[PDB]
Amino acid sequence: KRIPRKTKGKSPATAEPGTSNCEHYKARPGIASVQKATESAELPMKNNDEGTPDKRGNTKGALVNEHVEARDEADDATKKQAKDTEKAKAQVTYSDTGINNANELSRSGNVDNEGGSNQKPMSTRIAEATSAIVSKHPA
Amino acid sequence: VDSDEVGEQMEPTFEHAVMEIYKGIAGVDSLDDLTKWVLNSDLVPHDDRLGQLFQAFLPLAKDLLAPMARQFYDNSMSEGRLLTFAHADSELLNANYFGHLLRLKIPYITEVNLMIRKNREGGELFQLVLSYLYKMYATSAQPKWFG
Numbered sequence: 001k002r003i004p005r006k007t008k009g010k011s012p013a014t015a016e017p018g019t020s021n022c023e024h025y026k027a028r029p030g031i032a033s034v035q036k037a038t039e040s041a042e043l044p045m046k047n048n049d050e051g052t053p054d055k056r057g058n059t060k061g062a063l064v065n066e067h068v069e070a071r072d073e074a075d076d077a078t079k080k081q082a083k084d085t086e087k088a089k090a091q092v093t094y095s096d097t098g099i100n101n102a103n104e105l106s107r108s109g110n111v112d113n114e115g116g117s118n119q120k121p122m123s124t125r126i127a128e129a130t131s132a133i134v135s136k137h138p139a
Numbered sequence: 140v141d142s143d144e145v146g147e148q149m150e151p152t153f154e155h156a157v158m159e160i161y162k163g164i165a166g167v168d169s170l171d172d173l174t175k176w177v178l179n180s181d182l183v184p185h186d187d188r189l190g191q192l193f194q195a196f197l198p199l200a201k202d203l204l205a206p207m208a209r210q211f212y213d214n215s216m217s218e219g220r221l222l223t224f225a226h227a228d229s230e231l232l233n234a235n236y237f238g239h240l241l242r243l244k245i246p247y248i249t250e251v252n253l254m255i256r257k258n259r260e261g262g263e264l265f266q267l268v269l270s271y272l273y274k275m276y277a278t279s280a281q282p283k284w285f286g
Contacts, residue, residue, distance in 0.1 A: 086187030
């Protein structure tokens with residue numbers, strides 16, 4: 001009973017002759033090592049929620065070109081790979097491969113869902129567009 | 140002369156100075172997390188992580204321990220002949236030690252004593268990682284049989 005949430009959300013009987021444990025078995029592949037490797041590889045995939053609206057309607061993310069996004073993310077993945085393998089230069093690189101990939105894109109906060117730029121947040125666009133209609137009481 | 144004497148005579152003592160080494164790492168946040176990030180579920184730590192830790196441990200040993208020892212061993216040499224111990228020949232070589240430099244070695248597995256003994260500063264895992272660092276600061280040469 002009373003399972004809490006995790007996200008704010010709102011709207012004669014002697015000893016039997018067979019039981020014992022002392023020693024005399026060590027798992028060869030390594031139970032703790034395999035267990036840690038499983039713990040590592042068990043993690044859910046990352047959430048890439050850029051270019052998606054907030055609740056107010058403003059697409060979340062940084063303001064820079066999508067190709068720059070792709071290159072920066074490839075570089076960041078290479079750097080994180082180098083850190084994970086504990087070397088100054090990563091061996092499995094995602095950037096500066098032999099392939100020409102100059103047409104690749106990604107999802108930044110620069111473009112909204114209409115296809116237009118994101119120089120202004122949608123709240124600001126809507127507010128300015130609605131401000132050009134309001135009248136007032138006569139003097 | 141005990142092996143710890145040259146490191147104990149400092150306001151932050153040497154082992155206390157190296158206990159704060161986990162701040163330089165990319166992220167550890169605690170000495171126990173350092174001992175867990177270094178060697179896995181037995182000894183024989185990860186060589187890459189041990190290297191990342193040694194690159195920080197070294198400047199503490201070249202800039203503090205060597206200058207302090209260069210004066211301590213002179214003060215000791217002034218007041219008579221003494222039999223002095225150390226944890227690595229580099230300690231007696233960097234700090235310019237005068238006398239006979241006898242490397243030595245024992246017929247046991249020294250790494251298990253670091254778990255048997257209890258009341259040492261920092262966890263037993265920290266004493267052991269410290270021993271690994273000294274062993275990595277060792278300038279390979281024949282230890283030649285303490286007997």
